[PDB]
C-alpha cells in the first residue's frame, strides 16, 4: 500500500458507514451474476439461476459478510496485506485454484457496490483510493502462485 493520508480518510471515513451486513452480499452476488463463470465455485449454494435467485440467496449473503470481513481486516492491515491473507491465499490458490483475475473482479464489483450505495460521495479520488486497496488485496491473495 501507500495511500496519501488524504487517501486514508476518504477510505477510512467513507467505510465507517457501509451496511456491512448487506454490502458483502451485493458484491459476491453481483459477481456471480455479472461474471457468471464464477458460479462454478458456488454450485453448492442453491439456485443461482436468475439474479433474483442469486441476490435473495441466504448462502450468498452469508459468504458476502465474510468477504467484506476479510476486507475490513485488510483495510486495517495495509502495512502487511500479503501475510494477513496467507491462509486465504492458500485457500483460493493452491486449494481452490481461482484465477488471480477473479480477485480483480470481486474488488471491482465491490467498488461498484460502493459506487452504488454511497453514490455522489464516492468521488473519483475516493475511488482511486479504494481502487488501490482492491488491487493491493487482489495481490496478497494472488501471492501463492509464485
Amino acid at each position: 500500500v501507500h495511500l496519501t493520508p488524504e487517501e486514508k480518510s476518504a477510505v477510512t471515513a467513507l467505510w465507517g458507514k457501509v451496511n456491512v451486513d448487506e454490502v458483502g452480499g451485493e458484491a459476491l452476488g453481483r459477481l456471480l451474476v455479472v461474471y457468471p463463470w464464477t458460479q462454478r465455485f458456488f454450485e453448492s449454494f442453491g439456485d443461482l439461476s436468475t439474479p433474483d435467485a442469486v441476490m435473495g440467496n441466504p448462502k450468498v449473503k452469508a459468504h458476502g459478510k465474510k468477504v467484506l470481513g476479510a476486507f475490513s481486516d485488510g483495510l486495517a492491515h495495509l502495512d502487511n496485506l500479503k501475510g494477513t491473507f496467507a491462509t486465504l491465499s492458500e485457500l483460493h490458490c493452491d486449494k481452490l485454484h481461482v484465477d488471480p483475475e477473479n480477485f480483480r473482479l470481486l474488488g471491482n464489483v465491490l467498488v461498484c457496490v460502493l459506487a452504488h450505495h454511497f453514490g455522489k460521495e464516492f468521488t473519483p479520488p475516493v475511488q482511486a483510493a479504494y481502487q488501490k486497496v482492491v488491487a493491493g488485496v487482489a495481490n496478497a491473495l494472488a501471492h501463492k502462485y509464485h
Binding site: 455479472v34 471491482n108 467498488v111 461498484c112 459506487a115 455522489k120 473519483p124 479520488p125 475511488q127
Partner: protein, 141 residues
Amino acid sequence: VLSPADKTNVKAAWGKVGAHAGEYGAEALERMFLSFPTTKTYFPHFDLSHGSAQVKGHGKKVADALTNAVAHVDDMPNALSALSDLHAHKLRVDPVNFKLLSHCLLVTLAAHLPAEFTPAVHASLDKFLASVSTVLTSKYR
C-alpha cells in the same frame, strides 16, 4: 451477442440518463485518470485537471459514441469501425485500457442511477460496454 433483454436493460439505463450522459463521460474519464494513472499516457496534450474544459469536452464525445452505440446496438461494428480504426490503428490503445474505462463508466453510472442499477442491468450493462470495447478492439483481432 447481447440478448434482447440486455439491449432493453441498456437502452433503459441509458435513457434514464439524459443530458447528464455527456457529464457522465467526463466524470468517468476523471475517475479513470485518477484511478488508473497508467491510462494518462494517452492524453499528454490534455490537462487532466479536475475541471479541464478538455476532460469535460472528451466526455461529451465519448458519451455520444456510447449513445451512437446504444442506438445501433444490433449493429455497432459498422458504426464504430470509424473509432475502431482510430482507437486501434492510429492511437494504438492498449486493450486493457478499454476494461478500466468500461469500469469507471459503470462505477459512474452506479453513482448516479441508484434506482435502476439493478444487478440485472449492471450485468446487462457491462456486457454492453464489453461489446463496445470488443468492437473498438476488434480492429486488432
